Amino acid sequence: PYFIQRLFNTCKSSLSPNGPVSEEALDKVRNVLEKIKPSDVGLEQEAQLVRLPAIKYLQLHECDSFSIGIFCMPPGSIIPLHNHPGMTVLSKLVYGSMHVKSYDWAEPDQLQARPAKLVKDIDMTSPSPATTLYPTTGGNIHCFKAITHCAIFDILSPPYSSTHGRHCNYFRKSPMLDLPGEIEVMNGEVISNVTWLEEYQPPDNFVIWRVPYRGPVIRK
Ligand SMILES: [Fe+3]
């Protein structure tokens, strides 16, 4: 019970309904989470399978300051492109390999196609360092594709909240053409390899099964 309790404790200290109280506070969460192993959250058995399919979501905690969850992905399964408005997400591969692709908007905010720049397009393999995304940097729009069985540990602050207007919006590449691959933004910054994204409702193909958490109990 040590690790998950120490992790939850650091989150209560470091995270607020406006987000991480500070970068130093956030790094303290990251330092704990970097030491996670499958046994700490009860996934030692799923972790040895590393060698159209439904994804499992384990909710470890939700409150107004932060959310903690784990996605267990079977090979070839996909988390489609989505964003995290106003949110910071700390995230960590527990086991397995996956492909991540992420973007950030080319410009600051003001259902039409909007230009975004590529930030990450790479496979990750355990052990792999914890990643961080911010409201406007670090790849706030991302998608995941499982190579092996894999499991992502996710800390979101603040959590999604549709009544507070922090929805999980899904995105597709715009079919519209005569859209330029290279644009110039504020301060004359040149953005090459632009991708034009538009909101869309995720396909009925996408199934998240909520599954009860069965690891070391958290004392809340
Ligand atoms: Fe996400």
Side-chain angles (χ1 to χ4, degrees), residues 1 3-23 25-34 36 38-43 46-51 53-109 112-185 188 190-203 205-220:
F3 165 88
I4 191 66
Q5 189 67 36
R6 195 196 271 107
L7 177 60
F8 177 83
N9 286 346
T10 309
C11 291
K12 292 172 111 281
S13 147
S14 307
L15 307 167
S16 90
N18 314 289
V21 309
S22 85
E23 211 64 289
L26 184 70
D27 300 347
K28 279 172 194 198
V29 192
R30 194 187 297 96
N31 291 342
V32 176
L33 169 69
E34 207 83 77
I36 196 174
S39 69
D40 300 322
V41 291
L43 297 168
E46 285 235 273
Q48 277 134 351
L49 319 171
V50 173
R51 67 190 38 144
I55 291 156
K56 289 146 277 302
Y57 178 67
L58 297 59
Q59 179 162 95
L60 272 64
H61 182 80
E62 188 122 344
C63 66
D64 273 355
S65 293
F66 62 92
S67 154
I68 302 177
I70 304 178
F71 292 99
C72 287
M73 309 171 69
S77 71
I78 283 169
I79 300 177
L81 209 51
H82 66 277
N83 81 329
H84 323 71
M87 298 168 247
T88 304
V89 177
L90 196 52
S91 153
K92 173 62 159 176
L93 202 45
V94 178
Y95 59 77
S97 296
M98 72 182 343
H99 184 91
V100 55
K101 191 164 191 146
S102 64
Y103 307 83
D104 282 301
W105 299 126
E107 305 215 74
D109 275 39
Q112 197 245 308
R114 180 177 179 188
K117 55 180 159 166
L118 194 72
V119 170
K120 219 192 238 198
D121 182 22
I122 210 179
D123 306 323
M124 311 179 298
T125 299
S126 306
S128 196
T131 63
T132 303
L133 62 87
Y134 301 96
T136 67
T137 70
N140 190 262
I141 308 123
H142 62 199
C143 64
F144 296 104
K145 181 158 187 221
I147 293 149
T148 68
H149 289 85
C150 61
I152 311 168
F153 195 101
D154 268 337
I155 305 178
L156 302 82
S157 170
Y160 284 117
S161 180
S162 68
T163 62
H164 287 44
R166 296 186 310 256
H167 303 92
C168 186
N169 313 282
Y170 293 85
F171 293 91
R172 49 160 39 121
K173 290 167 83 144
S174 175
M176 199 162 76
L177 209 36
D178 298 319
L179 292 184
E182 212 186 351
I183 64 162
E184 218 166 290
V185 296
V190 175
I191 306 170
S192 270
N193 275 264
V194 168
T195 296
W196 296 80
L197 295 181
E198 38 182 58
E199 214 164 274
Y200 93 115
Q201 300 299 109
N205 91 307
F206 179 44
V207 197
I208 292 286
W209 291 104
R210 261 286 272 283
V211 171
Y213 165 67
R214 296 301 187 203
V217 194
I218 305 135
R219 201 211 175 305
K220 304 237 166 66

